[PDB]
Amino acid sequence: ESIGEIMGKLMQGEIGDEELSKRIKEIFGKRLQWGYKPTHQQQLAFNLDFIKSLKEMTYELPSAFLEAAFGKTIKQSGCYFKDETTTIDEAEEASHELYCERAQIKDGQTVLDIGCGQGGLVLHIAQKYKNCHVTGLTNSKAQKNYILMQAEKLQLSNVDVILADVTKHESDKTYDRILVIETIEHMKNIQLFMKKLSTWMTEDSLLFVDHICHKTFSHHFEAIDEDDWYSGFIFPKGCVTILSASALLYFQDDVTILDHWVVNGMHMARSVDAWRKKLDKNMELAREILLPGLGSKEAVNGVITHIRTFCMGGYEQFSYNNGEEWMVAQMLFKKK
């Protein structure tokens, strides 16, 4: 059975959830076999090769659809679930709190959020710390517009948004706190990225980075073999890197580490599960929202299949071995 066959049945909804989960789990199993080496000597050789390799390197979903699929603040990153009964809305808030603690946010600081998405964290900080000035940076005009609208509705006067590709953005402005939440995965050139960030810091600044990781090894999000239909379906563009939990320790040319944590993968698994369940509940509504801007019911079904499969696959990835394979890494840095 080829890619085309599985992809065919997937699109027609002919693959049940049990079989889909089983197939994706097997794909991730093969990645683990690829990544784990027999000795620490070999493991480090493998990891350092990856790190050395790094040092050499328009359609948007309507907001109404996003609101039907994601939690209240449309957080598009791993959330934090205290209980089995924690709702996605509660888990978003808990994550926001966690970032504020770990990044040592204090009232009165200037804060920059890089790749701020729909601006949940920006809005959280602005509301909690009235004397902070909070800037979001996004490459999406739609996202900028959404954040500014929300700030107006929430009577916030301390929010601004920079519309820019961060890799091209030039400014002399510095910030007390820089946050990068699950954005570094998309960065083509990390050494340059960290260098740029350092130029936006003073001696008093802190930088907080959160990224999806594997505990042991790094990998690009791409197919190992021909049997992997999943990786290329989800990200048809080789633009996602999954760093090991310790990978950023090797990128301290321009910044110095102060603290380092990981969050168990079950939190991410619970996040994607919540999105999948919410999308399922609002399926009829979702199809109606998407139809105008997509043109055909066939195109709508395609977009929905893609998002739903992402969630099903994410569940298998992050829940693997009770969250002890793929997880989230967090680091705090100061400037050199």
Ligand X SMILES: C[S@@+](CC[C@H](N)C(=O)[O-])C[C@H]1O[C@@H](n2cnc3c(N)ncnc32)[C@H](O)[C@@H]1O
Site string (37-66) toward a copy of itself, x via CB under 8 A: --xxx--xx--x------------------
Binding-site string for ligand REN from residue 33 to residue 72, where x marks contact by CB under 6 A and - marks none:
----------------------------------------
| Binding positions for ligand X, 140-159, rule CB under 6 A | 140
Which residue's CB atom is positioned nearest to ligand REN? 182
Task: Look up residue 128 and give its amino acid.
Answer: K
> Residue 76 annotated as binding?
yes
Q: How far is the CB of 121 from ligand X (least distance, A)?
A: 6
Q: What count of residues does the chain have?
A: 336
The response to whether 143 counts as a known ligand-binding position is yes
Q: For residue 318, give the nearest of 81, 52, 115 by alpha carbon.
A: 81
**34 or 261: CB nearest a copy of itself:** 261
Name the residue nearer to ligand X (CB basis): 186 or 219: 186
User: At its nearest, how many Å lie between a copy of itself and the CB of residue 16?
Assistant: 32
Site string for ligand REN, 303-332 (x = CB under 6 A): -------x---x--x---------------
Choice among 79, 116, 132, 311 that is catalytic: 311
- Whole-Å CA distances, 312 to 39, 259, 308: 33, 32, 6
* From 67, 90, 185, 222, residue interacting with ligand REN (rule: CB under 6 A): 185
**Residue 132: active-site member:** no
**Contacts (CB under 6 A) with ligand REN, residues 66-95:** 76-77
116 residue type, one letter: C
Instruction: Give yes or no for residue 81 binding a copy of itself (CB under 8 A).
Output: no
178 scored as a contact of ligand X (CB under 6 A): no
- The answer to whether 291 and 170 are in contact (CB under 8 A) is no
Contact yes or no for 314/306 (Cβ under 8 A): no
Q: Please report where in the chains the tokens 């008093």 appear, as a residue.
A: 204
Instruction: Select the residue interacting with a copy of itself from 215, 219, 220, 306 (CB under 8 A).
Output: 215
Q: On the CB side of 78, how many CA atoms lie within 13 Å of its CA?
A: 30
Instruction: For the chain, state the CA radius of gyration.
Output: 20
131 is in an annotated binding site: no
Minimum gap (Å) between residue 48 Cβ and a copy of itself? 6
Binding site for ligand X (CB under 6 A): 75-77, 115-117, 120, 138-140, 165-167, 181-183, 186
Give catalytic residue positions. 311
Which residues are documented as binding site for S-adenosyl-L-homocysteine?
76-77, 139, 143, 165-166
Which residues belong to the annotated binding site for S-adenosyl-L-methionine? Answer: 76-77, 165-166
Binding site for ligand REN (CB under 6 A): 76-77, 182, 185, 212, 221, 240, 310, 314, 317
